[PDB]
Design a protein around this ligand. Sequence first.
Ligand SMILES: Nc1ncnc2c1ncn2[C@@H]1O[C@@H]2COP(=O)(O)O[C@H]3[C@@H](O)[C@H](n4cnc5c(N)ncnc54)O[C@@H]3COP(=O)(O)O[C@H]2[C@H]1O
Ligand SMILES: Nc1ncnc2c1ncn2[C@@H]1O[C@@H]2COP(=O)(O)O[C@H]3[C@@H](O)[C@H](n4cnc5c(N)ncnc54)O[C@@H]3COP(=O)(O)O[C@H]2[C@H]1O
Ligand SMILES: [K+]
Ligand SMILES: [Mg+2]
Ligand SMILES: [Mg+2]
Ligand SMILES: [Mg+2]
Ligand SMILES: [Mg+2]
Ligand SMILES: [Mg+2]
Length: 90
Amino acid sequence: TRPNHTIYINNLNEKIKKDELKKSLHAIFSRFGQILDILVSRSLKMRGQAFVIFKEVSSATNALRSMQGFPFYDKPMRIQYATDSDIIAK
RNA sequence: GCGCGCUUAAUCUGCAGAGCGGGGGACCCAUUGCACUAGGGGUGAAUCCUGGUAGGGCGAAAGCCCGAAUCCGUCAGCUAACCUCGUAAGCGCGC
Ligand SMILES: Nc1ncnc2c1ncn2[C@@H]1O[C@@H]2COP(=O)(O)O[C@H]3[C@@H](O)[C@H](n4cnc5c(N)ncnc54)O[C@@H]3COP(=O)(O)O[C@H]2[C@H]1O
Ligand SMILES: Nc1ncnc2c1ncn2[C@@H]1O[C@@H]2COP(=O)(O)O[C@H]3[C@@H](O)[C@H](n4cnc5c(N)ncnc54)O[C@@H]3COP(=O)(O)O[C@H]2[C@H]1O
Ligand SMILES: [K+]
Ligand SMILES: [Mg+2]
Ligand SMILES: [Mg+2]
Ligand SMILES: [Mg+2]
Ligand SMILES: [Mg+2]
Ligand SMILES: [Mg+2]
């Protein structure tokens, strides 16, 4: 719940492949600001989740506030704030 | 060495078939998971608590024992089709 450069999204449709999911997430979130990276994994623990890392925290906050609850692949996205991502911390 | 047996998927036929087993792997169902570095998982009865113990083997029974080892490599839920490998080894009696 603490503001971060990286936003954490879950409740995502697990049938959607990594490439397509990342492409769609970039498509939707790039309008809020420059995206540093998008981490997606389909492992047992990490599936249904994604990490969108923004260049600016303001972008992260606006994206989160704006896309909170968005119908994405027939499921409402659940968005919270990320610890800092390795790319940012470094 | 051979004849019965025993744990085990570990046995038969002339490296390969048959038989017996292990793992991956859709739809369906279940899973809401804070990652970018031991974690997660598989064979087996062999797991846990600080000698006990879950769980297993022989035995009609009472009783006697095991309660090991090791591997995949950061990854594996269920799962037809399908893809794959294993068929090592350790003993008890007799001649
Ligand atoms: N899969 C398993 N799960 C749990 N526990 C297991 C197990 N396999 C074996 N055990 C236990 O550990 C001991 C190991 O015996 P092993 O098979 O080396 O050696 C055995 C066996 O090779 C042989 N044996 C046992 N019963 C036999 C029988 N009825 N006929 C012929 N030979 C027998 O003589 C030895 C006597 O063993 P014993 O039964 O006193 O003790 C056995 C058994 O109690
Ligand atoms: N789903 C999974 N998740 C995580 N790790 C997994 C896994 N599946 C397999 N592994 C591990 O990786 C190896 C893969 O070889 P595979 O299981 O084909 O090779 C196995 C298997 O094909 C066969 N096997 C194992 N247990 C068997 C059994 N009970 N009956 C018949 N064959 C068996 O012999 C080999 C034994 O070697 P081992 O099991 O040490 O070697 C296994 C195991 O250590
Ligand atoms: K088991
Ligand atoms: Mg062969
Ligand atoms: Mg099994
Ligand atoms: Mg599976
Ligand atoms: Mg038996
Ligand atoms: Mg899977």
